[PDB]
């Protein structure tokens, strides 16, 4: 892996539920029978989305958590673990969706402002989630509802494994800038969603609060603004993600629009801290999504994370290490193109994540955007997972796998794996004064050969004299490897002489040797 290291100690591969409730797809006693299959496969445990919409349905605190107990009992049953999602997002809603739970109706009703909801630049309407500027509504509702989850939940303390909160759309902390209401949709650049009148007055109490008065603002971003009212967001989107995000103008407003994300960020882990704490004492974590497309675009730069929120992920991310939640990024099948029109660049932005997930030291969780039909793609994802330091995996979702041996016999294979420590052993290693001893193999968690940024290093044991290291394999799998010295300069010097093998890596911590 990076810099030297190996795969993430923790790694677990987790299995997404279906969207429709168990008794729609199938029945409990086969779930879990399939539960124990998917255990047999390497899963660890099931992620699945607990709907706002069915549990608080009727009306204020008219709570629904039946389902969600039930859910946990076959849980229990089958002997596996569940990762639940506070679902306070829609689910479905759009042409031939396989679901169509909106938030509770009687929400909307709490204001008569616009305050609620979104609206983009052409004044297109989104309602599939809670605008995070009405933070008071989202404080009231979501402390009410992550409360009485844990009060519900508490029975099955047991098989829950780790807690996820929706922080946005689809799940995502992020705006709704891509739909095709808005004509938004991938592969286009997004629109920005702060045109309703609370938006606009949120922003302009910001910018006079940060400057005091308008001749402030005026001198600030050099600009001749004859009155507050003229204090607003980009009039065109794409002017804006083209050249106005360079002025001081711009960068203010990305820094309140990315800003109000962050906050939520921050309000939503202090409520579920709260909450789940001191009962469950498992992580929480969040998603963020991975909005690839328009990322290398030469006139418009990043423009589809912009409009999305995402301006800076390091402050981003900064804001989830505060909060105290898990990061997982939505995106790890895919591969750069780069190319018009949709300068997609997947690979590289999941890669800037990991990065800065990992200089931070949050705990990293990635997932696949799309399907998998092909090993392939399970190659892809491996690659990221194990060089990136992924503490886990969440595969989306349950029937690809469920229904399709083939499919479920090459996951288990290459990410369904348990990682143990090993002590890999090289004598005779002719070194010098600067060479540092690496080593390589075939599967993704020996780096794929790769001798570049991938080899995992060794170290000189001055007392046995040679070299060795504890390295973190993948258990019951079959392995191919080979010792290289890497000069002080960072090229090969030279290789083991004969491949090493280990057929298969032991369930049990014992170290291989071998002669260089
Ligand atoms: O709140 C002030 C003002 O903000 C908005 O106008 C922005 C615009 O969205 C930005 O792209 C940027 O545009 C400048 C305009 O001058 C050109 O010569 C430059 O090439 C662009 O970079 O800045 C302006 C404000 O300075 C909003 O559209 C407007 O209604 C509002 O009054
Ligand atoms: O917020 C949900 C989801 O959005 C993003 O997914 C992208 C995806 O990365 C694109 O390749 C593209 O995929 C579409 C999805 O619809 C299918 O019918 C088409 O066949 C695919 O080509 O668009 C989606 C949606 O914009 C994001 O990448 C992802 O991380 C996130 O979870
Ligand atoms: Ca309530």
Redesign the pocket.
């Known amino acids: 892996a990076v810099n030297g290291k190996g795969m993430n100690p923790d790694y677990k591969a987790y299995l997404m539920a279906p969207l429709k409730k168990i008794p729609e797809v199938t029945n409990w006693e086969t779930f879990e029978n399939d539960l124990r299959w998917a255990k047999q496969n390497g899963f660890y445990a099931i992620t699945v989305d607990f709907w706002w919409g069915d549990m608080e349905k009727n009306g204020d605190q008219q709570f629904d958590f039946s389902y969600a107990q039930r859910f946990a009992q076959s849980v229990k049953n089958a002997g596996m673990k569940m990762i639940p999602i506070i679902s306070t997002h829609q689910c479905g809603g759009n042409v031939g969706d396989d679901c169509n739970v909106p938030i509770p109706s009687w929400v909307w009703n709490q204001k008569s402002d616009d305050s609620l909801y979104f609206k983009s630049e052409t004044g297109t309407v989104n309602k599939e989630t809670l605008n995070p500027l009405a933070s008071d509504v989202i404080r009231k509702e979501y402390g009410e509802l992550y409360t009485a989850f844990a009060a519900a939940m508490k029975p099955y303390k047991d098989v829950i494994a780790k807690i996820y909160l929706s922080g946005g759309p689809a799940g995502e902390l992020r705006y709704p800038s891509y739909t095709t209401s808005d004509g938004t949709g991938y592969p286009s650049r997004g629109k920005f969603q702060a045109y309703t009148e609370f938006a606009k007055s949120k922003?302009?109490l910001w910018?006079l609060n940060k400057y005091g008065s308008l001749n402030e603002?005026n001198k600030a971003?050099?600009?001749k603004?004859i009155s507050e009212l003229?204090?607003?967001?980009?009039?065109?989107?794409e002017?804006?993600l083209?050249?106005?995000?360079?002025?001081?103008?711009?960068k203010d407003?990305l820094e309140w629009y990315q800003g109000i994300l962050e906050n939520h960020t921050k309000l939503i882990g202090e409520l579920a801290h709260n909450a789940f704490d001191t009962t469950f004492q498992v992580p929480i974590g969040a998603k963020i999504a991975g909005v690839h497309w328009q990322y290398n675009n030469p006139t418009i730069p990043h423009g589809a994370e912009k409009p999305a929120g995402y301006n800076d992920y390091s402050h981003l991310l900064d804001a989830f290490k505060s909060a105290k939640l898990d990061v997982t990024f939505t995106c790890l099948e895919m591969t750069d193109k780069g190319s018009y029109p949709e300068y997609s660049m997947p690979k590289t932005l999941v890669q800037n994540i990991a990065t800065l997930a990992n200089e931070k030291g949050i705990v990293l969780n990635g997932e696949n955007a799309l399907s998998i039909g092909n090993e392939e793609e399970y190659k892809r994802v491996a690659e990221m997972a194990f060089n990136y330091n992924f503490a886990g995996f969440t595969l989306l979702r349950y029937q690809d796998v469920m229904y399709n041996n083939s499919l479920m016999g090459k996951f288990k294979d290459l990410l369904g794996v348990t990682p143990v420590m090993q002590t890999i052993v090289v004598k005779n290693v002719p070194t010098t004064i600067g060479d540092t001893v690496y080593i390589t193999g075939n599967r993704a968690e020996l780096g794929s050969w790769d001798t570049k940024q991938y080899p995992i290093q060794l170290y000189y044991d001055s007392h046995s004299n040679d070299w060795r290291g504890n390295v973190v394999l993948p258990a019951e799998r079959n392995i191919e490897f080979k010792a290289f010295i890497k000069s002080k300069d960072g090229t090969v010097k030279s290789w083991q002489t004969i491949q090493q093998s280990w057929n298969p890596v032991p369930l049990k911590t014992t170290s291989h040797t071998s002669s260089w």
Request: proline share 7%.
């Open positions: 922003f302009r910018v603002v971003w050099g600009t603004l003229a204090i607003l967001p980009p009039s065109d989107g002017q804006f083209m050249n106005g995000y360079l002025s001081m103008y711009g407003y």
